């Protein structure tokens, strides 16, 4: 059985475990000996949790961030139903005893004893909230449509439970000596070499002799730098480049001076070099894997004496204001000076002390360390700045991760894309970090599922893989029942692909029509019909995918013939009727991210009281330029309702009122006002969103709209003004805000009240898009390389100037913008 889960396993992450084994790695081994240790206990815990606490782990509450409504509800093993009346006000508790003592009725004749699952749905209603509170109820409204509950109880859930079972001695300089390396070039070869502490050098780099680019290389030159090997930190990260000269660069290898176990290294090294895009400080410490083609450098670490990076015992044995809100040598000499007034005084300034200490000097990384072990706790938004490369320590990273674990679940859940990423960062294995999400993921089930695709959809990956891998094994480990869940997603998007390369192939050789019926007749094999129906969508693991329906599966007859894939349940009703667009060709990355970030403002938004009716749909990468888009239904593009096509209900006298007259269509008598107001307020979010994010390029392709009238984007190419962009207001926008009319400021100017106020509050989080944007430089996104486009979103947000500067400002730009439209 154990030989069963380790097959299983291997083929879930895409990496056999036995090439984990073949490496003979000790700090493999030893993460994955720890690491499964935990994850074990981890199961253990779970399985004895109460029933409560087990929909907590399995299915956590989705909630927001007087009124009477009606709600249809059942109970497990029977059909028949009742709608009652409640209040949005009242609890889920309330709502049961009226199910029960109906109940009680029919039947001719205790609410703590069940929960309330949403219909079709791994949604859950209970705790003590008000409906509305609910997302799933507060949503019901909104559309207009009957909540449909089933009561399921506490016996029904602990079976679910019960079948989801498992020294400062050596002042001499540092030096190494280059001896040799095996490369390709056209010309004389050089090798740079410094060492760094995050990204700051601790001393000068050193540099080779020039040699010509035969070879083979050989050097078997000393390189001395100048500090005292005392004085290299925990940290220390050595960075080589080999390039060619007359700047030709060739490949870079960097590692760690000290080991997982503290020791300093010696003595001999040959480093597996990573082909080039001089010095990479960010890029990681482990050698390319691809070691039959890789360039390879040997070098020599000389045995300075074993030496252990002392103990923290040993450690900790051994005007102002102004400033304080980029800084000058002088001013950064004060804020040393007074350490201890910034930690009594100044707390949350941490990370601008952390970057004065001379991380080069062993004496002050021992003050500023001494310091960091009495500091008090900071807040969230402080702990995410601390884990920007700047700041490698594993002090400050273990303080990080301290002041990061009063994260709740939805927070964490938020930032979870940009933790994935900093692991990319990690000097070792074995970290803090991967310990903190691991423990989270094994806590939260929907934690797990997304921890898990982050981390599978870049297996592809070489510089990752063999981490990534390793933490998805630990996980498995820690849930059995959740690895043959994810397998099964896994299987049906084996099969998506396969079934993507067919269309591909048949529609060159054929018309969109005929490619249909052909897809349709790969799908309903046994093997495909099994595989690609009942599962839990990658998307979110709360909706299911029940019965594909493979009449309505088409695929878009262009570009990377995207899929389009409609299910149905019987069980869910209406809200069974669900649709996954899956495309092979593109990188889905910067649509992830663009999404996520849209999803943060409109939470903040809420958070203050305002909602610009938007659209946050899943979008998912789960492999090499593979992954999933979540469909909104009851939609279409922009041009396709400019098509303005007679003999539909749409048709105009004038192109301009084409999109009213759909809206009208859809949205009959007084309908139509609502639908104004949705679209007016979803416009505003998203004229705000783009231009915050610099998303350009934007035209009635990539715009759509619902028959509710909410507006939204689709297809982000280009974000952070990789093409300054222009705030845009579109002429058929501005007509339907005004309801037709020529003239009608009265609206209009309601729509930039909306914007100004979308606009201001993301100001004041302004702070947050940038330590979450920071983080993301991790990725390796081509339109997130550099610091220009991190300025990019200062210049957006116009973070220097007071609200009322700022405010002025996107006022000339909004103006200019309505200037722009006709
Ligand atoms: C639904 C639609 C209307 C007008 C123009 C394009 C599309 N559309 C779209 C537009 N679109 C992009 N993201 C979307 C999304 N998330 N929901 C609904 N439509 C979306 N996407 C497709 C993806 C795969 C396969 C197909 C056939 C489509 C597709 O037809």
């Known amino acids: 059985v154990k030989k069963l889960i380790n097959s299983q396993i291997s083929l879930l992450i895409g990496k056999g475990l036995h090439e984990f084994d073949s490496l003979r790695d000790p700090e493999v081994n030893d993460f994955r000996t720890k690491m499964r240790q935990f994850c074990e206990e981890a199961a253990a815990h779970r399985q004895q949790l109460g029933w409560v606490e087990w929909l907590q782990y399995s299915f956590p509450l989705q909630l927001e961030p007087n009124r009477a409504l009606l709600v249809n509800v059942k109970f497990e093993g029977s059909e028949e139903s009742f709608t009652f009346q409640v209040s949005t006000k009242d609890m889920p508790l309330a709502l049961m005893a009226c199910a029960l003592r109906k109940k009680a009725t029919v039947f001719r004749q205790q609410p703590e004893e069940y929960a309330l699952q949403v219909n079709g749905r791994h949604e859950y209603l209970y ?15 909104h559309s207009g449509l009957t909540p449909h509950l089933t009561m399921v109880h506490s016996s029904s859930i602990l079976a679910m439970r019960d079948e989801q079972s498992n020294l400062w001695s050596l002042e001499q300089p540092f030096s190494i000596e280059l001896i040799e390396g095996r490369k390709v070039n056209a010309m004389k070869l050089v090798v740079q070499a410094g060492l760094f502490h995050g990204n700051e050098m601790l001393c000068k780099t050193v540099s080779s002799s020039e040699v010509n680019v035969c070879s083979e290389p050989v050097w078997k030159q000393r390189l001395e730098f100048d500090i005292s090997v005392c004085d290299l930190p925990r940290m220390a990260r050595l960075c080589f480049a080999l390039y060619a000269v007359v700047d030709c660069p060739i490949a870079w290898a960097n590692l760690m001076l000290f080991d997982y176990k503290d020791q300093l290294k010696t003595g001999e090294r040959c480093l597996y070099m990573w082909p080039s895009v001089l010095l990479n400080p960010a890029g990681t410490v482990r050698g390319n894997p691809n070691t039959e083609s890789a360039a390879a450098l040997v070098i020599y ?5 074993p030496v252990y990076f002392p103990a923290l015992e040993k450690i900790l044995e051994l005007l102002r204001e102004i400033l304080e809100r980029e800084l000058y040598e002088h001013e950064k000499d004060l804020v040393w000076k007074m350490r201890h007034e910034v930690q009594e005084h100044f707390p949350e300034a941490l990370a601008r002390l952390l970057l004065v200490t001379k991380w080069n000097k062993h004496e002050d990384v021992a003050q500023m360390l001494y310091l960091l072990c009495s500091w008090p706790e900071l807040p969230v938004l402080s702990a995410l700045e601390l884990l920007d490369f700047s700041f490698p320590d594993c002090y400050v990273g273990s303080f990080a991760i301290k002041s990061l674990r009063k994260l709740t679940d939805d927070e964490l ?88 390369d067919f269309v591909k192939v048949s529609s060159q050789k054929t018309t969109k029509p005929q490619t249909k019926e052909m897809m349709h007749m790969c799908m309903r094999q046994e093997t495909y019909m099994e595989a690609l129906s009942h599962l839990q969508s990658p998307l979110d693991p709360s909706t299911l995918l029940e019965e594909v329906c493979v009449e309505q599966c088409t695929f878009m007859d262009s570009k990377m013939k995207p899929l389009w894939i409609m299910y149905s349940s019987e069980e869910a009703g209406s809200a069974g009727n669900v649709g996954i667009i899956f495309k092979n060709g593109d990188d889905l990355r910067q649509d992830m991210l663009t999404l996520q970030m849209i999803q943060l403002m409109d939470v903040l938004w809420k958070q ?58 859809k949205n009959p008598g007084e309908a139509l006002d609502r639908a104004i107001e949705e679209f007016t307020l979803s416009c505003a979010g998203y004229c705000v969103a783009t231009y915050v994010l610099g998303i350009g390029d934007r035209h009635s392709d990539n715009i759509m709209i619902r028959e509710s009238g909410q507006l939204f984007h689709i297809d982000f190419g280009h974000f952070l003004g990789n093409f300054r962009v222009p705030f845009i207001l579109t002429y058929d926008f501005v007509h339907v805000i005004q309801q037709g009319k020529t003239n009608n400021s009265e609206k209009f100017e309601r729509f930039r009240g909306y914007c100004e106020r979308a606009y201001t509050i993301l100001r004041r989080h302004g702070l947050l898009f940038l330590h979450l944007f920071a983080l993301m430089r991790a990725a390796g996104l081509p339109e997130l390389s550099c610091s220009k486009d991190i300025q990019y979103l200062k210049d957006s947000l116009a973070l220097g100037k007071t609200e009322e500067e700022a405010l002025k400002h996107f006022r000339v730009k909004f103006n200019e913008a309505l200037r722009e439209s006709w």
């Open 301 to 305: 670490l000389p045995e300075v004496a």
């Open 608 to 665: 203050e009281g305002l909602d610009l009716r938007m659209t946050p749909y899943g979008c998912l990468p789960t492999g090499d330029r593979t992954g999933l888009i979540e469909v909104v239904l009851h939609s279409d593009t922009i041009a396709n309702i400019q098509l303005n096509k007679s003999n539909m209900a749409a048709t105009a006298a004038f192109n301009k009122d084409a999109l009213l007259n759909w809206l009208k269509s």
């Open 413 to 500: 859940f938020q930032y979870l894309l940009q933790l994935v990423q900093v692991l990319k960062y990690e000097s070792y294995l074995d970290c803090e970090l991967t310990k903190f999400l691991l423990g989270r993921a094994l806590a939260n089930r929907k934690i797990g599922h997304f921890l898990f695709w982050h981390l599978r959809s870049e297996m592809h990956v070489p510089s990752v893989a063999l981490r990534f891998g390793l933490i998805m094994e630990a996980y498995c480990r820690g849930s059995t029942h959740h690895m043959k869940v994810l397998m099964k997603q896994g299987e049906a998007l084996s099969k998506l692909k396969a079934l993507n």
């Open 127 to 141: 705790g003590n909230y008000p409906l509305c509170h609910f997302q799933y109820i507060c949503s019901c409204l």
